[PDB]
């Protein structure tokens, strides 16, 4: 998969199962998505005043036990 | 800023719902930073880690329930804020003492007694956004302050969706350059 993929993707400009997969299998992509998504929220001022880099991590981790 | 990526939503919850937990770190990727945001007009800072976690806890378990009868963020959010309200009813019912414990703990006693401001970050952004060519910032710009899809834009800028598509990528991978260290 190609990063200009992953960016037509996280705008919903392509919804192909198979980028999905990939993306949810790929380290890189990974980074990817969540740059571009933080990206994003600074952007629209989606952000509180401190961001915490540590959130989704936690959050799976709960997943993870249950 | 957009319908077009609820698709993406919907399709993760989608996934979700059928036991995938990759794709739930997906979403949560998507949108941790936006609930905290929602969640940190309520409650203490100290406090916002604890109920961003626990807001999405909720949302994944009541997941089997969202119908997709309203957008998937809406229905977070109204997670978030109920989960955070919550947390402030239970802060608004401390006893007499919890006060004076919050002073005598306050100041330190001798002895012994993952983070960025989010404006640091949007300058440094903004100021990548301002240095880029036009046709990269009015693509970005149109995409993601406005909201509109590719078709939008092309329409907008008449050129061809395949060259919206680029500009966009490009101008994330200039922002993320400076951005992602």
Redesign the interface.
Same mark, same amino acid.
């Given at each position: 998969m190609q990063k200009e993929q992953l960016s037509a993707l996280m705008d919903g400009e392509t919804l192909d199962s198979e980028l999905l997969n990939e993306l949810a299998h790929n380290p890189e992509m990974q980074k990817t998505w969540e740059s571009y998504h933080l990206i994003r929220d600074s952007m629209r001022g989606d952000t509180p005043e401190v961001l915490h880099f540590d959130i989704s991590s936690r959050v799976m981790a709960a997943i993870e036990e249950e | 800023?957009?319908?077009?990526?609820?698709?993406?939503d919907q399709?993760?919850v989608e996934?979700v719902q059928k036991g995938?937990?990759?794709?739930?770190?997906?979403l949560?990727?998507?949108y941790?930073?936006?609930?905290?945001?929602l969640?940190?007009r309520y409650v203490p @800072?100290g406090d916002?880690?604890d109920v $961003?976690?626990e807001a999405?806890?909720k949302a994944?378990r009541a997941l089997d329930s969202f119908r997709g009868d309203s957008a998937f963020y809406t229905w977070l959010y109204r997670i978030a804020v109920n989960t955070a309200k919550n947390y402030l009813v239970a802060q608004g019912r401390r006893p007499p003492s919890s006060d004076v414990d919050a002073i005598e703990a306050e100041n330190f006693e001798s002895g012994g007694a993952?983070?960025?401001? @989010?404006?640091e970050?949007?300058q440094i $952004?903004?100021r990548t956004?301002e240095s880029l060519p036009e046709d990269l910032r009015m693509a970005?710009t149109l995409?993601?302050?406005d909201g509109l899809?590719?078709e939008e834009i092309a329409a907008i800028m008449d050129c061809p969706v395949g060259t919206v598509?680029?500009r966009?990528?490009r101008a994330?991978?200039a922002?993320?350059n400076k951005?992602?260290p």
């Open positions: - | 800023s957009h319908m077009s990526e609820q698709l993406t399709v993760l996934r995938d937990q990759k794709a739930f770190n997906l949560v990727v998507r941790q930073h936006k609930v905290a945001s969640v940190s @800072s916002v880690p $961003v976690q999405f806890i994944y993952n983070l960025m401001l @989010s404006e970050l949007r $952004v903004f956004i970005i995409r993601e302050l899809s590719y598509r680029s966009i990528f994330r991978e922002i993320d951005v992602q």
